[PDB]
Protein backbone atom coordinates (compact mmCIF):
# COMPACT_ATOMS: atom_id res chain seq x y z
CA UNK A 1 0.00 0.00 0.00
CA UNK A 2 3.05 2.29 0.25
CA UNK A 3 4.69 1.83 -3.15
CA UNK A 4 2.94 -0.35 -5.75
CA UNK A 5 -0.42 0.30 -7.42
CA UNK A 6 -2.34 -1.76 -9.97
CA UNK A 7 -4.52 -0.55 -12.82
CA UNK A 8 -6.51 -3.81 -12.85
CA UNK A 9 -7.08 -6.37 -10.11
CA UNK A 10 -9.81 -8.98 -10.60
CA UNK A 11 -10.44 -12.20 -8.67
CA UNK A 12 -12.45 -15.27 -9.68
CA UNK A 13 -13.83 -17.85 -7.28
CA UNK A 14 -13.56 -15.79 -4.08
CA UNK A 15 -14.53 -12.34 -2.80
CA UNK A 16 -11.48 -10.13 -2.36
CA UNK A 17 -12.49 -9.04 1.16
CA UNK A 18 -11.97 -12.59 2.46
CA UNK A 19 -8.42 -12.98 1.09
CA UNK A 20 -6.94 -12.35 4.56
CA UNK A 21 -8.99 -15.08 6.26
CA UNK A 22 -8.00 -18.05 4.08
CA UNK A 23 -5.06 -20.30 3.30
CA UNK A 24 -4.09 -21.41 -0.20
CA UNK A 25 -2.99 -24.82 -1.44
CA UNK A 26 -1.14 -24.82 -4.80
CA UNK A 27 -0.07 -21.28 -5.66
CA UNK A 28 1.44 -20.48 -9.05
CA UNK A 29 2.28 -17.10 -10.58
CA UNK A 30 2.39 -16.49 -14.35
CA UNK A 31 4.21 -13.43 -15.68
CA UNK A 32 4.20 -11.72 -19.08
CA UNK A 33 3.92 -8.34 -20.86
CA UNK A 34 1.16 -7.18 -23.23
CA UNK A 35 -0.11 -3.92 -24.70
CA UNK A 36 -2.87 -1.85 -23.12
CA UNK A 37 -5.66 -3.05 -25.42
CA UNK A 38 -4.93 -6.74 -24.69
CA UNK A 39 -5.39 -6.63 -20.89
CA UNK A 40 -9.13 -7.22 -21.38
CA UNK A 41 -8.27 -10.53 -23.06
CA UNK A 42 -6.78 -12.06 -19.89
CA UNK A 43 -10.08 -13.43 -18.57
CA UNK A 44 -12.15 -16.63 -18.84
CA UNK A 45 -14.21 -17.07 -22.00
CA UNK A 46 -12.45 -14.49 -24.16
CA UNK A 47 -11.35 -14.37 -27.79
CA UNK A 48 -8.67 -12.46 -29.67
CA UNK A 49 -5.04 -13.01 -30.64
CA UNK A 50 -3.75 -13.37 -27.06
CA UNK B 1 -4.90 -10.17 -35.94
CA UNK B 2 -2.16 -8.57 -38.08
CA UNK B 3 -3.38 -4.98 -38.39
CA UNK B 4 -6.52 -3.93 -36.50
CA UNK B 5 -7.00 -3.80 -32.73
CA UNK B 6 -10.05 -2.85 -30.66
CA UNK B 7 -10.18 -1.06 -27.34
CA UNK B 8 -13.57 -2.59 -26.49
CA UNK B 9 -15.21 -5.78 -27.74
CA UNK B 10 -18.26 -7.09 -25.88
CA UNK B 11 -20.77 -9.74 -26.96
CA UNK B 12 -24.31 -10.38 -25.68
CA UNK B 13 -26.21 -13.63 -26.09
CA UNK B 14 -23.23 -15.87 -26.94
CA UNK B 15 -19.77 -16.68 -25.57
CA UNK B 16 -17.05 -15.27 -27.81
CA UNK B 17 -15.11 -18.56 -27.91
CA UNK B 18 -17.94 -20.22 -29.87
CA UNK B 19 -18.12 -17.55 -32.60
CA UNK B 20 -16.20 -19.81 -35.02
CA UNK B 21 -18.58 -22.76 -34.62
CA UNK B 22 -21.86 -21.06 -35.53
CA UNK B 23 -23.71 -19.56 -38.48
CA UNK B 24 -25.68 -16.32 -38.35
CA UNK B 25 -29.07 -15.48 -39.83
CA UNK B 26 -29.80 -11.74 -40.21
CA UNK B 27 -26.57 -9.76 -39.83
CA UNK B 28 -26.62 -5.97 -39.67
CA UNK B 29 -23.79 -3.55 -38.88
CA UNK B 30 -24.38 -0.08 -37.40
CA UNK B 31 -21.63 2.53 -37.65
CA UNK B 32 -21.09 5.86 -35.88
CA UNK B 33 -18.53 8.01 -34.02
CA UNK B 34 -18.65 9.12 -30.36
CA UNK B 35 -16.28 10.54 -27.77
CA UNK B 36 -14.32 8.39 -25.33
CA UNK B 37 -16.63 8.93 -22.35
CA UNK B 38 -19.72 7.83 -24.31
CA UNK B 39 -18.52 4.33 -25.29
CA UNK B 40 -19.86 3.00 -21.97
CA UNK B 41 -23.33 4.14 -23.05
CA UNK B 42 -23.51 1.70 -25.98
CA UNK B 43 -24.95 -1.19 -23.95
CA UNK B 44 -28.38 -2.53 -22.92
CA UNK B 45 -30.12 -0.77 -20.05
CA UNK B 46 -28.08 2.44 -20.07
CA UNK B 47 -28.92 6.13 -19.66
CA UNK B 48 -27.26 9.34 -20.78
CA UNK B 49 -27.46 11.66 -23.78
CA UNK B 50 -26.46 9.02 -26.36
C1 LIG C 1 -17.76 -6.89 -41.00
C2 LIG C 1 -18.77 -8.02 -41.11
C3 LIG C 1 -18.72 -8.88 -39.85
C4 LIG C 1 -19.88 -9.87 -39.88
C5 LIG C 1 -19.61 -10.98 -38.87
C6 LIG C 1 -20.94 -11.48 -38.31
C7 LIG C 1 -20.96 -12.31 -37.29
C8 LIG C 1 -19.67 -12.78 -36.63
C9 LIG C 1 -19.68 -12.38 -35.16
C10 LIG C 1 -18.64 -11.77 -34.62
C11 LIG C 1 -17.39 -11.45 -35.45
C12 LIG C 1 -16.44 -10.63 -34.60
C13 LIG C 1 -15.43 -9.94 -35.51
C14 LIG C 1 -14.41 -9.17 -34.69
C15 LIG C 1 -13.68 -10.11 -33.73
C16 LIG C 1 -12.54 -9.35 -33.05
C17 LIG C 1 -11.72 -10.30 -32.19
C18 LIG C 1 -10.75 -9.50 -31.32
O1 LIG C 1 -9.66 -9.09 -31.80
O2 LIG C 1 -11.04 -9.24 -30.12
C1 LIG D 1 6.61 4.27 3.05
O1 LIG D 1 7.50 4.87 2.08
C2 LIG D 1 8.17 6.05 2.56
C3 LIG D 1 8.96 6.60 1.40
O2 LIG D 1 9.89 5.66 0.90
C4 LIG D 1 9.04 5.68 3.76
O3 LIG D 1 9.68 6.85 4.26
C5 LIG D 1 8.18 5.05 4.84
O4 LIG D 1 8.99 4.63 5.93
C6 LIG D 1 7.41 3.86 4.29
N1 LIG D 1 6.53 3.29 5.30
C7 LIG D 1 6.71 2.08 5.82
C8 LIG D 1 5.71 1.66 6.86
O5 LIG D 1 7.63 1.35 5.47
C1 LIG E 1 12.14 -1.91 -7.48
O1 LIG E 1 13.53 -2.27 -7.44
C2 LIG E 1 14.43 -1.20 -7.79
C3 LIG E 1 15.82 -1.77 -7.75
O2 LIG E 1 15.87 -2.98 -7.00
C4 LIG E 1 14.23 -0.02 -6.83
O3 LIG E 1 15.07 1.06 -7.24
C5 LIG E 1 12.77 0.41 -6.83
O4 LIG E 1 12.57 1.44 -5.87
C6 LIG E 1 11.87 -0.77 -6.51
N1 LIG E 1 10.47 -0.37 -6.54
C7 LIG E 1 9.63 -0.61 -5.53
C8 LIG E 1 8.22 -0.13 -5.73
O5 LIG E 1 9.98 -1.18 -4.50
C1 LIG F 1 1.16 -9.04 -41.71
O1 LIG F 1 1.58 -7.69 -41.96
C2 LIG F 1 2.94 -7.56 -42.40
C3 LIG F 1 3.23 -6.08 -42.50
O2 LIG F 1 2.35 -5.44 -43.41
C4 LIG F 1 3.12 -8.31 -43.72
O3 LIG F 1 4.47 -8.22 -44.13
C5 LIG F 1 2.72 -9.77 -43.53
O4 LIG F 1 2.81 -10.45 -44.78
C6 LIG F 1 1.30 -9.87 -42.99
N1 LIG F 1 0.94 -11.26 -42.76
C7 LIG F 1 -0.01 -11.89 -43.45
C8 LIG F 1 -0.25 -13.32 -43.08
O5 LIG F 1 -0.64 -11.34 -44.34
C1 LIG G 1 -6.96 1.26 -44.43
O1 LIG G 1 -7.04 1.76 -45.78
C2 LIG G 1 -6.00 2.68 -46.13
C3 LIG G 1 -6.28 3.14 -47.54
O2 LIG G 1 -7.17 2.24 -48.20
C4 LIG G 1 -4.63 2.01 -45.98
O3 LIG G 1 -3.61 2.96 -46.26
C5 LIG G 1 -4.47 1.46 -44.57
O4 LIG G 1 -3.24 0.76 -44.46
C6 LIG G 1 -5.63 0.54 -44.23
N1 LIG G 1 -5.51 0.04 -42.87
C7 LIG G 1 -5.55 -1.26 -42.56
C8 LIG G 1 -5.41 -1.60 -41.11
O5 LIG G 1 -5.71 -2.12 -43.42
From Swiss-Prot, chains A, B:
<feature type="glycosylation site" description="N-linked (GlcNAc...) asparagine; by host">
    <location>
        <position position="2"/>
    </location>
</feature>
<comment type="function">
    <text>Attaches the virion to the cell membrane by interacting with host receptor, initiating the infection. Binding to human ACE2 and CLEC4M/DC-SIGNR receptors and internalization of the virus into the endosomes of the host cell induces conformational changes in the S glycoprotein. Proteolysis by cathepsin CTSL may unmask the fusion peptide of S2 and activate membrane fusion within endosomes.</text>
</comment>
<protein>
    <recommendedName>
        <fullName>Spike protein S1</fullName>
    </recommendedName>
</protein>
Amino acid sequence: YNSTFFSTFKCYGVCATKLNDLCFSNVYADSFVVKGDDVRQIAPGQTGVI
